[PDB]
């Protein structure tokens, strides 16, 4: 099984997705078909009900940079991404918190702990 991502391609598209998500946290997954740890996230981590349920109230975005085309490269540069896998997290105000970035494989337990570490105005 698999998470329900919304694809974005460009910097502009990311920004409008963040505008529409405003009020809910966001996770942006940076993916490529050739990225082994990205496939491992799908196999071991995003497939785990604990992770799925933990992410149920998060807007999930994905950028597929497989081609490394001009738009992909501009997005990666804009986000100061150094390589894959990278997962970024934005709060409900749209602010990215760099300490939350995930830049290597994490199993379900580790990823869930990362996610843990604003609900109904609390």
Q: Radius of gyration (Cα) for the chain, nearest Å?
A: 14
Place of tokens 């085309």: 69
Assigned CATH for 1-122? 3.40.30.10
For residues 54 and 115, what is the distance between their CA atoms, to the nearest angstrom? 8
HEC states along 75-101?
A: HHHHCCCCCCCEEEEECCCCCECHHHC
What does the buried/exposed string (b/e) look like for 53-87 if buried means 16 or more CB atoms within 10 Å of the residue's CB?
A: ebbeebbbbbbbbeeeeebbeebbeebebeebbbb
For residues 59 and 5, what is the distance between their CA atoms, to the nearest angstrom? 8
**Cα–Cα–Cα angle for 103, 29, 114, rounded to 5 degrees:** 55
Measured in whole angstroms, the distance separating CA 47 from the mean position of its chain's CA atoms is: 15
Q: Would you give the DSSP letter of residue 44? A: I
For residues 91 and 77, what is the distance between their CA atoms, to the nearest angstrom? 21
Sheet holding 26-31, edge to edge: 6-7, 59-64, 26-31, 86-90
Enumerate the β-bridge partners of residue 90.
26, 96
What kind and span of H or E run contains 72?
helix 70-78
Give the experimental resolution in Å: 1.1
Domain map (residue ranges) of the chain: 1-122
Residues 6 or more apart whose CB falls under 8 angstroms from that of 87 comprise 27, 28, 29, 30, 101, 102, 103
**Cα–Cα–Cα angle for 35, 84, 69, rounded to 5 degrees:** 85
Residues in the chain: 122
Q: Contact 87/30 with Cβ under 8 angstroms?
A: yes
| Contacts by 104-107, CB closer than 8 A, 24 or more apart | 104/37, 105/37, 105/40, 105/41, 105/44, 105/45, 106/41, 106/45, 107/44, 107/45
């Amino acid at each position: 099984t698999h998470l329900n991502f919304t694809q974005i391609k460009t910097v502009d598209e990311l920004n409008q997705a963040l505008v529409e998500a405003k009020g809910k946290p966001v996770m942006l997954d940076l993916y490529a078909d050739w990225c082994v740890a990205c496939k491992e996230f799908e196999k071991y981590t995003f497939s785990d009900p604990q992770v799925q349920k933990a992410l149920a109230d998060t807007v999930l975005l994905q950028a597929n940079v497989t081609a490394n085309d001009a738009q992909d490269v501009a997005l990666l540069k804009h986000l100061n991404v150094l390589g894959l896998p990278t997962i970024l997290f934005f709060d409900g105000q749209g602010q990215e918190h760099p300490q939350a970035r995930v830049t290597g494989f994490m199993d379900a337990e580790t990823f869930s702990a990362h996610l843990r570490d604003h609900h109904h105005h609390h």
